[PDB]
Symmetry: D2
Amino acid sequence: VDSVYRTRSLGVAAEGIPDQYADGEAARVWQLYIGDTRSRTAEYKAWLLGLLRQHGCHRVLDVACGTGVDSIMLVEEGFSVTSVDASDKMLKYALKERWNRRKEPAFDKWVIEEANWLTLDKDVPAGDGFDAVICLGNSFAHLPDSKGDQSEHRLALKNIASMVRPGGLLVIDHRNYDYILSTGCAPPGKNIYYKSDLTKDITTSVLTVNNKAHMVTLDYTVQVPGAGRDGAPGFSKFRLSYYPHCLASFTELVQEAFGGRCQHSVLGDFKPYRPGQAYVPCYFIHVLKKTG
Amino acid sequence: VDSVYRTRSLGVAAEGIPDQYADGEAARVWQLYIGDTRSRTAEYKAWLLGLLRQHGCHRVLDVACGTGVDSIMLVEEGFSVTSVDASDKMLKYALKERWNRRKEPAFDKWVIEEANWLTLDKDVPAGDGFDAVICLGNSFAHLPDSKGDQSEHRLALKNIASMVRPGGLLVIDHRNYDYILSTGCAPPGKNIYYKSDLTKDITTSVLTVNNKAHMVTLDYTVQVPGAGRDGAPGFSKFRLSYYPHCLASFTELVQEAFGGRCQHSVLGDFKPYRPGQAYVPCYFIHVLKKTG
Amino acid sequence: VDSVYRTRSLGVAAEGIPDQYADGEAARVWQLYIGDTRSRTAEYKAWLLGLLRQHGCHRVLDVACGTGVDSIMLVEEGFSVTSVDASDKMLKYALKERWNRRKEPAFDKWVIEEANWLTLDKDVPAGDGFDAVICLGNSFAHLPDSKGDQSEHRLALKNIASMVRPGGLLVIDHRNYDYILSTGCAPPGKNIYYKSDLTKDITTSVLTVNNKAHMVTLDYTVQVPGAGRDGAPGFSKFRLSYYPHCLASFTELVQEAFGGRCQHSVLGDFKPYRPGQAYVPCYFIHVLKKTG
Amino acid sequence: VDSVYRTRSLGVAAEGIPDQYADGEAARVWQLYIGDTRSRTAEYKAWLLGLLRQHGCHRVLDVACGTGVDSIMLVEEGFSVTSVDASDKMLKYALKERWNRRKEPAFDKWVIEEANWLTLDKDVPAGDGFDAVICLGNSFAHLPDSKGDQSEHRLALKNIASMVRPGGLLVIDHRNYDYILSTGCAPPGKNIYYKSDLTKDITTSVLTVNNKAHMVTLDYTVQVPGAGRDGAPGFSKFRLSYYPHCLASFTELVQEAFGGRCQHSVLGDFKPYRPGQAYVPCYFIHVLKKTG
């Protein structure tokens, strides 16, 4: 018989006071980290828009909304964007931006909802489905596999696909985990979508359970400018984890998601990718095409 | 030399996956608690409105927004309302309603920001200061006194008082703690602002540090309807802590937050209050008035 | 679905490495605290021995052994001492002392076993019972009342009494919690048994659940000599909790332990105690006498 | 500003009440694990004794005592044994047996102290140093490398080597980690020292930090016999971590702990070992020899 009475239950709030670990030295950096968001890559801009237009799909579904930068560019670019995400900590940043630009017809017609890839089915009305669904930024790797059988993976995937209209497109990516798993390192400065103007340091931790890799953990040591003595910066650190997804595993995974009635194709970093390829991609973007 | 490797830093999120403790069985109830009290009291509506009108103050500031159910009525009532709070888990609900009704001019003009009492100065621009400032719901009792010298209580009240325009009003409240401190119990069904329709149970725990009452902790066991077998209710529980504010104590505290240059009043539940009163108030509402 | 993988399970050890929190800055002080043990009080020496002899009981049972100082003096004084305690963290200190003096016939015949007042029955063979059982040092107050009904109290007590031979004696004490509860403070320098040569500071925290006091917590700030800059001492802190036992409650509690077939008597600090007594005792020593 | 008030400081005890995590369902198993392997191996007995005799060394030092089952046999065999360890939760068992048999001259002469490899120098007086020093059981793998530069491994080995008299012997061992690192599994029933009679299950988790193997974590699910319904076994589990020591690595590590002035040898499970060997060892036993 022991005891450890804690002030407030975990996951509950009180007005007047900041949410639990909301202002920890680790939450602060991650904040100004998820904010290094804006400095997007031309290659990224020119690729997504061109791919988007080239197939004439207008109704886009972003199932990994987040701060809402991918979607804000789609909103500006004229597509019918509906953004969804499971983290209300992230979504808060999209809605903030929207409100500001609510005066803009486009931004006002912008739909930012909340949803989980595992409940997506009963989280977003599909109806006819959407022209295109995007899940970029290596975001599918955030969802872990507790049961070890990747049952939740197939579900998240199954669901996200059902959001795809027949003829619709699915642009889903993942980091080159084959490479990081092989080398045992996932260094900063490879993100193809948004150039991080933030200097960093990353310690890669790879965990294998009974020989099967199960998780890749990243400990970041960000050099926060101005948080130092005389102009000097500060060094805070935060931690995030992902599931090491191998190109092979994913390719078939994402495929059974459509039950086969699909059209698969894998891009190198943004360019076409063919095995044995001389160039090692830092990301693996899968673009699917539902049959019916 | 030990260790305890955790998946994600405390207070950080990842897109696609729900936030840290957002779905515990404690958060689910707390959720239907911060929302299952909303059935505003006629006595409340009529008292606040009337008093607001009586002194003819229009530009109001709600420094304890929360789910916004307070502000939403001032808004609805034509007041120039700006609602603030420190907890984002709470505001999310005020902005969720505002957006919902953004198609209403008043609501559209509704300002919902984020702010902390201890930083309210450089968090919200007053310039001339607001005519009125409410802080009902016993929200002030959420902020604790770690130092033991309530230095923060004073910082909070100074800041919050500084937000009042000369001739301006302040309406800050608290529960009758002189009473629960004595009975050692803080039973449910005493909200004078919103008649909850939720069946609750509460165990009261009072902590006196060195003969001085330092905190009140409420462990609520909510009887969640249907959450059981055959329609039977389920029993989930969360915990919340407060600072026991005694009347004498608060009366002089909130006052020194005005440097004395104020006009203080204190009423019963809603009717006016005098020591020794026959009727025992369930809440103590202070209504101050800045001179200059 | 979250996670927080910790290195070693809680409560398990590995050779070569120190036990979990065994060398924390709080464990260090408590160590040199439970060690201030030696500087026993004459009043204490002259009272226990004289009481012991006066009734000619030789077979003594110490159910709150600990470091083993109370028992070491009994061992030296010639009684047939069998010392028992539930904390292997404490017992380790008794055995250490014994081993050293194992060469001394007396110390070799000394019995240091392990046992819980709640399993005492099947933890120590009583047989005929013992002449005298001692539980001094306010040690019975360590066992808390989780269920709130003091069911474990009656059991611990019930058991400890069954260790008493008919005609045997039970010398059990407790701190004057009536006074500390009333004043809300339990200051250092009152221990009647062993003069603590260690300067301290104590913050008393009293917890009441639904008006019924349930626990008294003591936060000690010990002035460790030499742990300072230039001769200066250091200031570490540790924390311990007790159940606020009121003379009245205890008197009847300890009594039902014998089912009434007893002879009760309460000593002031060491002197006889009669209600309304001008002198406020810092400890309450109960000496019982089993009938049969 | 939050809080989490806990009953007792971490690592402190109170008399009468069991120690902090001493009785978790994880400690109960770990208990019948650190004890349910003891059925010493004839190959072991015969190898150690013989080698000890072969070099004629008599004053032995067991720097990884534990439950003492090792030393107890050297003791029984007339060796001048002194057994040390850092974990008191373990020694408690060696001294529990010693006392039990204190009535034996050899056992009586048995020295069981407390010590840490990183402090062994000023923890145990050598003067001339011991003839032999065993550290079997793969105990060295318990100490981890937080810094990441194994500076402690070196401190531990230096200290431990310093305890060897010139011409003295050192017998330190480790599991064949070159193998479990590759299969990614560390199955049960491989102790060459004591044939456990316990049915176990083990999930192996390897953590590589930046391409470097940094820790091995074993989650054991013991099938506790009878701990079920009708004689059926129960299933309790504990966790333990180790440092993956590769042969090449250790070979040069333990060597530099002698400044080179040594004679190194390494054998298979017990037989002698040569790289590429046909037989795969389950443990790597290094047997060094100090020159001067």
